[PDB]
């Protein structure tokens, strides 16, 4: 996949994972009204995926 | 192992696998007395390993 990952794939990855319900803004040395302000102004993004993805199915096995 | 297999390793591989009891000389368009002659002259080599190696142990599994 090196040299094969496309601009569209990155666009699609951001559009459907970098959304409000999947995000958290953490601040240190910043006031809450400021962090709340920027989140309400610039971080209100919808239209992605929902839950914590497809439930990770455990299988087991060995790689050598 | 590419670039790592040594002259000694090849010497050891031949000395203990290229022996009489592990060998067969097959001829086509040659007379048997001639093939028997060369085998008795040049192919009488001992001091290798014995049986068909360590008995191949079946395990199972999957490579992806």
Curated annotation (Swiss-Prot), chains A, B:
Compartments reported by the entry: Mitochondrion inner membrane
Residues recorded with modification N6-acetyllysine: 4, 55
Source species, domain of life: Eukaryota
Function noted in UniProt: Component of the ubiquinol-cytochrome c oxidoreductase, a multisubunit transmembrane complex that is part of the mitochondrial electron transport chain which drives oxidative phosphorylation.
Family: Belongs to the peptidase M16 family. UQCRC2/QCR2 subfamily.
Subunit: Component of the ubiquinol-cytochrome c oxidoreductase (cytochrome b-c1 complex, complex III, CIII), a multisubunit enzyme composed of 11 subunits. The complex is composed of 3 respiratory subunits cytochrome b, cytochrome c1 and Rieske protein UQCRFS1, 2 core protein subunits UQCRC1/QCR1 and UQCRC2/QCR2, and 6 low-molecular weight protein subunits UQCRH/QCR6, UQCRB/QCR7, UQCRQ/QCR8, UQCR10/QCR9, UQCR11/QCR10 and subunit 9, the cleavage product of Rieske protein UQCRFS1.
Protein name: Cytochrome b-c1 complex subunit 2, mitochondrial
Organism for this UniProt entry: Bos taurus
Primary gene name: UQCRC2
First-to-last residue of the parent protein present: 196 to 259 of 453
């Amino acid at each position: 996949r090196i040299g094969k990952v496309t601009p569209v794939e990155l666009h699609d990855y951001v559009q459907n994972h970098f959304t409000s319900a999947r995000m958290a803004l953490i601040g240190l040395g910043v006031s809450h009204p400021v962090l709340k302000q920027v989140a309400e102004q610039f971080l209100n993004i919808r239209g992605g995926l929902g839950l914590s993805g497809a439930k990770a199915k455990y299988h087991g096995g060995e790689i050598r």
